[PDB]
Design a protein around this motif. Structure first.
Motif, PDB file in Angstrom:
ATOM      1  N   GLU D  65      37.388   8.661   9.756  1.00 17.42           N
ATOM      2  CA  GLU D  65      37.560   9.756   8.814  1.00 17.42           C
ATOM      3  C   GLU D  65      38.456   9.410   7.631  1.00 17.42           C
ATOM      4  O   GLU D  65      38.083   9.632   6.481  1.00 17.42           O
ATOM      5  N   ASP D  79      37.899   9.763  14.582  1.00 17.98           N
ATOM      6  CA  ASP D  79      38.644  10.851  13.981  1.00 17.98           C
ATOM      7  C   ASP D  79      40.033  10.664  14.586  1.00 17.98           C
ATOM      8  O   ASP D  79      40.249  10.961  15.763  1.00 17.98           O
ATOM      9  N   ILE D  81      42.855  12.248  14.172  1.00 24.14           N
ATOM     10  CA  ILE D  81      43.371  13.519  14.663  1.00 24.14           C
ATOM     11  C   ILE D  81      42.404  14.621  14.247  1.00 24.14           C
ATOM     12  O   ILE D  81      42.201  14.862  13.052  1.00 24.14           O
ATOM     13  N   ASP D  82      41.776  15.273  15.212  1.00 27.03           N
ATOM     14  CA  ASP D  82      40.896  16.376  14.860  1.00 27.03           C
ATOM     15  C   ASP D  82      41.768  17.604  15.105  1.00 27.03           C
ATOM     16  O   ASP D  82      42.211  17.844  16.233  1.00 27.03           O
TER      17      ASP D  82
HETATM   18 MG    MG Z   1      40.751  14.412  11.594  1.00 21.53          MG
END
Ligand code: MG
Ligand code: MG
Ligand code: MG
Ligand code: MG
Lengths: 256, 256, 256, 256
Positions: D65, D79, D81-82
């Motif tokens: 991301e 990702d 940190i989602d």
């Molecule tokens: Mg994220």
């Protein structure tokens, strides 16, 4: 207070850095043998801590296992990783210890076992806690209904077992000095005895045991302080029962 | 899978009941004295398991530490609490063990420490796991790079420490046989020795270590089974010398 | 406090009971509809809580969600499970609420989320805690810099989310009133809004957020007590903006 | 197995890096407004993930991301940190997401919520798991038996809440797409809809829900893959109805 809260949050934060490397440190370094090791994470953890103290407590002293050995009437004693062997092999019994000694007097103590999510602490005159709730050493008064603890020492350990194994429910050797002392304060164990340890191994566990109503002394039964060489932690019920057995073992091997 | 998944969820569900009582059960019995107890929780936890076992495994047998000692080609070996003494005092090192033994063959095992949130398990041919991730045994091939363990036994203990203190980095005494054995499969410990033990104390440990690429044998050095009296678990790289030392520890006291 | 410490220990112990049936409850009863349910566990948990309080505080009144609707000077308000829907479906945002109301005002309050290992509590004039460490309301002074939250209501929720979304980072709907209010105190969210609520849903949160340094008023801005019908917990910095929007919502729906 | 285990351990390891800074992120940079941000922790953690993948699968592609957008037959979707906003404010609902997409089709997905200790995952063909335990979507066949969920969209949300709250027990807004999708697979939630999205938001969620016996389709009902921007996850028993409402909501705003 400010100091206690600061200590709790600091060790809780650093505890996570240790979790990153738990059981996964390839670089094991020997200090004075294979039983006494240190790693790069012991240091990184110590830097993380020492830096925050140095930041908020500008002109106060630090005595940290890995290197920093200052002196002061306002001294913070730090053990970046109490139980480095466990830490390296992947055992959960390791912790971070922070005691704040003033005029040679332990005013605050905090022990944080990261993999266990156990935070035992005590400030002078406020009593001992465990993750927020009150703790008090066990009521056990009979050695037969007791569970004691020791650390891996020279010939002491194996012998102390021999003596104790008879009049005791069971003996434990977990791996963390600070955490073992604190466990007596929380009632989990009945007594803990150490030999040839530095103040960073017992400064925090000392105020936590006494604030939890227990007893902390040297092998002579005379109340111990952060700078004693031998340590006996107990619920203050079967203390003497232990003072004896310990000297019984000490004499056998060689002492006095 | 079927019995594996079943077993994990079940012991995990039961672990929570244990948590309600953990450290808060002052109603202790003695199955053979102070050095061996049982509680209603032991009974209450075992019940919650055995019940469930039959609900889905009717034509199958069961063997629980306290109460049931059936036998058959489709057996389940249950240990409601492994480390009752710990559980009673408030120590995190206690577990629930369960093994499915088919035709005298441990087809799968699962160890669960509720306070530590650790679930170690293995299935024949499927390899060992730890909370979903794979686990192998340690690679430390020299006693000076090892940490060992054993339970509190008459003379074997204090005499095993002495006989191996300078041999290994540390010798730990944690309290739960099932957990300790599961730990060598996890590589957290290089070896664990148990003297005079029942099947429910090793059934699961056994298949976990072997599936984790380790070794489980009697003292004769011959492949061990669910039905043996003395066991030794290891990474299979330091077994030989351990067998050697084990076989030379009973000497100093007796036991033929 | 022995009262607060009493409260923390009781909800933590009862939390394990809940953990046994978390997500594993088959019989869900409708109290007033499918959106307002209750289970036997709610009752079992509550009973465990009420018996202990009545045992250690025999002459004080009790007001527990499922039935006990006493009134008095020394009153204990209880929500055996705040977020029964979450608890039933298997979501972690469910908690046990306990507050001590004296002569109309909440003297103490604790909120325990078992699946989350989060115990937020506060005793009047002592500050707010989170597992032993102090917490304080957030410092976000701008709405666009905030995260708000509400419960699940008929008309309210939708209009709310519409009349707030374009003026704040995000709005959250987690599922436990007590937990959500307490989070304003922990600083994890900036404000929590509840509509047509009950005392047992907000008594504990009320004091935690106030002790944490924030503000709790009804939909008119007037400070509130355990008995107001609508609430607004905030960090005190964004309050007005919130009360304004809320009424813009009470306005569209209807009122008088 | 080689890849799944590697993925599970990496994420849990990176998980602790996150825990160090959780809720204590000083500088928040804006990607496309306060509505969508990133922090150096996202980058710091991404780098730690990328680092390992480069080391063990050096000849493979990466789509992260925060700045890495490669393309290839062997590809890893990431990702860091989602639920960054959640991470920042200190809410536990945030997670790391990792998927390996071999030859355009995702064959492995891992979602780890560090603060919650939840590792949900699934390898194509072996079913969905949760910390080792097996999981399957829910069996609630009617919306009034369900708990749905949404992301915080500027127009979608409020509408969806409105046309769905009288139809179901509750609609949740958690703050972590990957975890929310993994939750339908875990059966903790019955359906989850996401409007405007990227492959790293739901690649891992896609496979987990599928291996869990549920269905993932775009808003049009047509099956869904790593590359689509409209997603509806469900237990496959209430799917049709959800697609209904979703579309209706689209008419209340705009589109084709
Ligand atoms: Mg994220
Ligand atoms: Mg150290
Ligand atoms: Mg047992
Ligand atoms: Mg309730």
């Amino acid at each position: 207070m400010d100091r206690l809260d600061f200590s709790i949050k600091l060790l809780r934060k650093v505890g996570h850095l240790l979790m990153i490397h738990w059981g996964r440190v390839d670089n094991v370094e020997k200090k004075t043998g294979f039983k006494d090791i240190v790693t790069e994470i012991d240091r990184e953890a110590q830097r993380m801590i020492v830096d925050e103290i140095r930041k908020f407590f500008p002109d106060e002293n630090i005595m940290a296992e890995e290197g920093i050995f200052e002196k002061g009437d306002r001294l913070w004693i730090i053990d970046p990783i109490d139980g480095t062997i466990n830490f390296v092999h992947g055992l959960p019994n390791f912790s971070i210890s922070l005691a704040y000694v003033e005029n040679g007097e332990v005013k605050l103590g905090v022990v944080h076992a990261p993999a266990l999510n156990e935070t035992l602490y005590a400030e002078e005159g406020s009593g001992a806690f465990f993750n927020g709730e009150r703790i008090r050493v066990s009521e056990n008064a009979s050695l037969e209904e007791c569970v004691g603890s020791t650390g891996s020492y020279v010939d002491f350990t194996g012998k102390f077992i021999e003596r104790m194994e008879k009049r005791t429910r069971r003996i434990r050797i977990l791996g963390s000095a600070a955490l073992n002392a604190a466990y007596v304060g929380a009632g989990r164990v009945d007594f803990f005895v150490t030999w040839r340890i530095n103040p960073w191994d017992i400064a925090a566990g000392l105020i936590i045991v006494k604030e939890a109503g227990g007893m902390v002394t040297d092998f002579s039964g005379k109340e111990a302080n952060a700078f004693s060489k031998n340590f006996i932690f107990s619920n203050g019920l079967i203390h003497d029962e232990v003072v004896k057995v310990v000297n019984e073992v000490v004499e056998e091997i060689g002492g006095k």
